[PDB]
Amino acid sequence: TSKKEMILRTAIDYIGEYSLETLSYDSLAEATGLSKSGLIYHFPSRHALLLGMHELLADDWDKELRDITRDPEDPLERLRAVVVTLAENVSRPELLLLIDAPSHPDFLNAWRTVNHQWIPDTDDLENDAHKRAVYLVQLAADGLFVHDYIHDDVLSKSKRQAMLETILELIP
Amino acid sequence: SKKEMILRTAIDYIGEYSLETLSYDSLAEATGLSKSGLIYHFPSRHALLLGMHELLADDWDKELRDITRDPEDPLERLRAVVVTLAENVSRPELLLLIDAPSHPDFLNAWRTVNHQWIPDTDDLENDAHKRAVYLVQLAADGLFVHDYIHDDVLSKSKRQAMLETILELIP
Amino acid sequence: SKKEMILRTAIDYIGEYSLETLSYDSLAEATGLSKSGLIYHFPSRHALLLGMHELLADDWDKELRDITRDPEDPLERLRAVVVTLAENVSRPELLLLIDAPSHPDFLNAWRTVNHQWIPDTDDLENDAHKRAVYLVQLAADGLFVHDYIHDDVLSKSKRQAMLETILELIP
Amino acid sequence: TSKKEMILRTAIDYIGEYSLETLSYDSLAEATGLSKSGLIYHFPSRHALLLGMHELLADDWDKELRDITRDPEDPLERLRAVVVTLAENVSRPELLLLIDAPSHPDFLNAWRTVNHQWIPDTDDLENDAHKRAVYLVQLAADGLFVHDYIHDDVLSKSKRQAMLETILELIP
DNA sequence: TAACTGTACCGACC
DNA sequence: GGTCGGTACAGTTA
DNA sequence: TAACTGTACCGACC
DNA sequence: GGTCGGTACAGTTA
Structure with missing residues (x-):
């Protein structure tokens, strides 16, 4: 009954x-x-309520990412699932929560799994053209994630599928 | 003042x-x-917030006019968009853009910018070149928002490099 | 409570x-x-003010029940109105009665007392009896407001003598 | 001008x-x-604005009282003007000020004329029939001054005159 | 016995 | 002229 | 030299 | 998230 x-x-x-x-x-x-x-x-406290919301949403996103991954060892295969959940499985609350999180370590920590095991590592990307090509995908998925909350002019599903495919075709 | x-x-x-x-x-x-x-x-509080939406919306229209020396091609506009998003718009602009739906006045202040400098989604489904430019738009929004939604601030070195790579992509 | x-x-x-x-x-x-x-x-403030109106309007009703010994007739209610106005009603009721028009809720809290105890102003151009009762109502009212609009508080004895004078005047 | x-x-x-x-x-x-x-x-200051108003209305009244007193030696004649200007020539502002007046020495003092040179005297009426029948009249006049603001039953012009006549008939 | 609900307060803040 | 985030604890319902 | 108007600013209270 | 009662001037209009 809880x-x-x-x-x-x-x-x-x-x-x-x-x-x-x-x-x-x-x-x-x-x-x-x-x-x-x-x-x-x-x-x-309100602090626990918010923690619970962060934790709950980060766990939705982790479960979503691990489910749709075909093989968890292939870097490009997991980047593809990042691109896909960013274009379909995350909405307004997650964005508001991402933005609020820096405001307390507890909230940052709740997002550590899904910002450190799924978002590609930024290493020597200044001089590595492949790594930077993997980050371009990440940046573009992030733009498609926030697009409807920052442009005032929602993408229709069809336009959003079309752009998702464009970000995918750009995976190395 | x-x-x-x-x-x-x-x-x-x-x-x-x-x-x-x-x-x-x-x-x-x-x-x-x-x-x-x-x-x-x-x-009133609403006036103070209207002030801030309007000031930032204006500053954004300013810097992206002092940066394009050919207002003609959607491509030179598009260049201006990427650079300003990449290098001179930060957390406050993101905060007010999220908050803007909460009042028509706030939306109305960004209307000028949000449609004048923003590429057209219109028929994107069937136009590969129109998807190549929106991809750039999307990557820019990506760099604009990057440090405020991943607990990881890019260094100036990394940020400059990703700006270039996006600048490459331009049709 | x-x-x-x-x-x-x-x-x-x-x-x-x-x-x-x-x-x-x-x-x-x-x-x-x-x-x-x-x-x-x-x-809310409205609720507090409504509470004070309700309380005084209801004490005055009670204080004018344990005093009147025959609710039947015009005159025994009038005697009671006069006595309560003269001695168990002071500055707070005056203030609240002045404020009461500011809102229907407040007027309403004074319905019971304001018509049901206070004699009618009806049919008063032509009825001598009805003018002699309203005269008494005016005097009682005068004694009730006296200390608060004249820069001169009466003593208990002055007040009883006057109370008694209005009481004689009862038709 | 001013x-x-x-x-x-x-x-x-x-x-x-x-x-x-x-x-x-x-x-x-x-x-x-x-x-x-x-x-x-x-x-x-607002204080100075309320005093101006207290002062001005007490003079309108004092003026009105001596304007309508034919013989000012006569204690019954001034009692008649009092009643008359009470039942006819004072309204709400006048009541609100009277009620506010005791909240400051300056306000009290500004009503000192009309309250002293015009209001009859509470002097051993405990043992004196005539004096007390003079107070009764004052008492009813005050009642007709406050009626409309205290009873939620504005008197018509005609009923107000009827009652004024009745208080006046109650005179010597 | 864990999951509530209601009642009476209060300091910082809007 | 309030809201908001607590705090405290007694009394009820799954 | 008097009677204003406008502009900016603030502490106590609501 | 404000109002209420100012304070403090500089300029204006008769």
């Missing part, structure tokens, strides 16, 4: 719709049906 | 912290003015 | 000062509670 | 229609089309 995960989904859904500044116990109570004491029961 | 100075301080303030802790009070510190003198200049 | 002790302190504050300077902070000083403890109990 | 009496009149009219707590430099600037600076020139 509604601890349901609260987080509700909180994530809420920040997509509205935003972080406006997420508070009262407004999460209103949205969960729960009472404020109820929420405090699982998340005794 | 005292107005532009206050707005400049508010922009650095949000780069360092966020919109949500931008308050008349926290802004009175950073600017040295009293909470009340601040309100004299920006009589 | 803690609500009722809070209203009671607010009633005495406005007796000493005014409604205009009655604020959550100034009522927190006077009650011992914190600003937000008070807001827990009355969540 | 807008000074004109500002006070506007301020009086303002609070009649609205009230005292809302009367401010800003709101009085709007009502007068003057500037806050303009108002502060005549009235260096």
Whole structure:
């Protein structure tokens, strides 16, 4: 009967719709049906509530990346899954959370797996043309991830598939 | 003008912290003015935010005009877009671009820029060359946002190199 | 109930000062509670003011039940109106009655007393009896407001003599 | 010229229609089309603006009282004017000021004429029938002055005259 | 017995 | 003239 | 030399 | 996230 995960989904859904500044116990109570004491029961500070949201979303993204990877040892094969989940499996909440995370080490740490085991390493890229060609993909996937929140002019699915394919065809 | 100075301080303030802790009070510190003198200049919070959207939107239209010496070709515009995104737009611009949907006034302030300098998505599905330019656009947005969504700041050396590689890609 | 002790302190504050300077902070000083403890109990200012109106309008109704010994007739209600106006109603009720038009909720809290106890102003051009009762109502009202609009508080004895004079005048 | 009496009149009219707590430099600037600076020139503080208003209205009244007293030796004649100018020639502003007056020595003092040279005397009426029947009249007049602001039942012009006549008939 | 809900407060801040 | 993030603890429902 | 207007700024309170 | 009561001038209009 523990509604601890349901609260987080509700909180994530809420920040997509509205935003972080406006997420508070009262407004999460209103949205969960729960009472404020109820929420405090699982998340005794706002800091825990946010941690849980970061953790929850980083774990969605890790599970998503590992599932769609055909072979986990092939670098290019995992870069392809980074490109794909960035174009389809991450939305507004993740972006707001990525941006909020630097604001506390706890939140940074919650994202360490998926920023250190899936995003390609920046090493001597000044003078390595292949490595820099692998980073160009990463940069382009990141632009397709944030595109609809920064351009005010959403891509339709069809345009987004077309651009996803273009970022893929560019994998070495 | 005292107005532009206050707005400049508010922009650095949000780069360092966020919109949500931008308050008349926290802004009175950073600017040295009293909470009340601040309100004299920006009589509501919405005005203060409208100021900041407008200042940044304008600065962006400025720098990308002082950088293209041929406004004609979508390609020279496109060059201007990549460089400004790569090297002279930071965290505050990203913060206000995210926040902009929350009021029509905010959207309206970026309207000039967001459609005038931004390549056209229009028929992208069938035009390979139009997908080659949007790929550049996307890579630029990638470098613009890079350090604020991966816990890893690029060094100036790395950043310059990725700018070039993107600059290469240009049709 | 803690609500009722809070209203009671607010009633005495406005007796000493005014409604205009009655604020959550100034009522927190006077009650011992914190600003937000008070807001827990009355969540908006409207609610606090509605509470004070309700409380006085209802004490006056009660104080005018254990005094009138035959709710039946116009005259025994009038005697009661006169006595309560003369001696168990002071500056807070005057202040609240002046403020009460500022909102329908407040007027409404004074319905029971304002018509059901106070004699009617109806049919008063032509009925001598009805003018002799309203004369008594005006005098009672005059004694009620006396200390607060004339720079001269009456003593208890002066007040009883006058009370008694209005009471004689009863048709 | 000098807008000074004109500002006070506007301020009086303002609070009649609205009230005292809302009367401010800003709101009085709007009502007068003057500037806050303009108002502060005549009235260096709000205190000085309320006194102006207390002073002005007590003189309108004192003027009105002696304007309508035929024989000012006669204690019953002045009692008649009191009643008359109470039932006919004072309105809301006048009530709000009276009620506010005791909150400051200057305000009390500005009402000293009309309260001393005109209001009959509470002097051993405990044992004196005539004196107390003179107070009764004063008492009913005060009641007709406050009626409309205390009872939520504005009297018609006609009923107000009817009641005024009745208090007057109660005279010597 | 864990998962709540309600009630009464309060300091920093908007 | 409030909100917001707590804190404290008693009383109820799966 | 008086009666304003506008512009910037602030502490206490709401 | 503000209003209310100023303070402090410099310039303007009769």
